[PDB]
């Protein structure tokens, strides 16, 4: 059966409004996966996001109009063939990328089936999915920040003391030869 023009408009409007508030939109090829798999992926997502994340297979035409109206650009390359969409409306989005990345891995699926998307308003490619998926926890990040911020000072001491080490290194070298 055909959908009324009004029914279609409502679906497009709803989707468009959702994409206007999401912090992540990732496009995935979910062909071949079973309902059991869908159920498991959704469960892994919910355990971490509750209702803040969704994973739904959505017809390309619908996705296109919704993205178009939400004012997105350069997404057409992500809608070639049946495509499912993973989006986050509440909570930090990084963990959802990790979840679906590790799910495809557990299922032994081609990781290129994770086509790319938009993260916090920034477009990312398929190859970049791995980058996001492997990001360390926020806590680990905060920890690393301190040493990164101290680098200049750390580098100064290392450079000055390195002048003395060069003498030691070359003397050892001369001893090495013999």
């Amino acid at each position: 059966v055909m959908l009324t023009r009004q029914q279609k408009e409502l679906i497009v409007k709803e989707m468009s409004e959702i994409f206007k508030k999401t912090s992540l939109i990732l496009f995935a090829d979910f062909l071949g996966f079973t309902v059991a798999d869908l159920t498991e992926l959704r469960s892994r997502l919910r355990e971490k996001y509750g209702d803040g994340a969704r994973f739904r297979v959505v017809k390309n035409t619908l996705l296109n109009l919704a993205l178009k109206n939400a004012e997105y650009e350069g997404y057409e390359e992500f809608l070639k063939g049946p495509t499912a969409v993973l989006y986050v409306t509440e909570g930090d989005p990084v963990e959802a990328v990790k979840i679906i990345y590790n799910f495809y891995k557990d299922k032994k699926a081609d990781l290129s089936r994770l086509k790319g998307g938009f993260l916090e308003g920034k477009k990312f490619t398929a190859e970049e999915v791995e980058n996001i998926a492997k990001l360390p926890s926020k806590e680990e990040l905060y920890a690393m920040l301190v040493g990164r911020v101290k680098a200049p000072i750390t580098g100064l001491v290392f450079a000055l003391s390195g002048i003395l080490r060069n003498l030691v290194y070359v003397l050892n070298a001369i001893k090495e030869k013999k």
């Binding site: 989005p93 990001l135 926020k138 690393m144 920040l145 580098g155």
Partner: peptide, 30 residues
Amino acid sequence: MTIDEIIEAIEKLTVSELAELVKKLEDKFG
């Protein structure tokens, strides 16, 4: 901005933004 202002802006960053900060700092120093 002041030290305090810097720290405040830092703790408001998302995980993605914070990771970007760490990497750029990484490229700029050391």
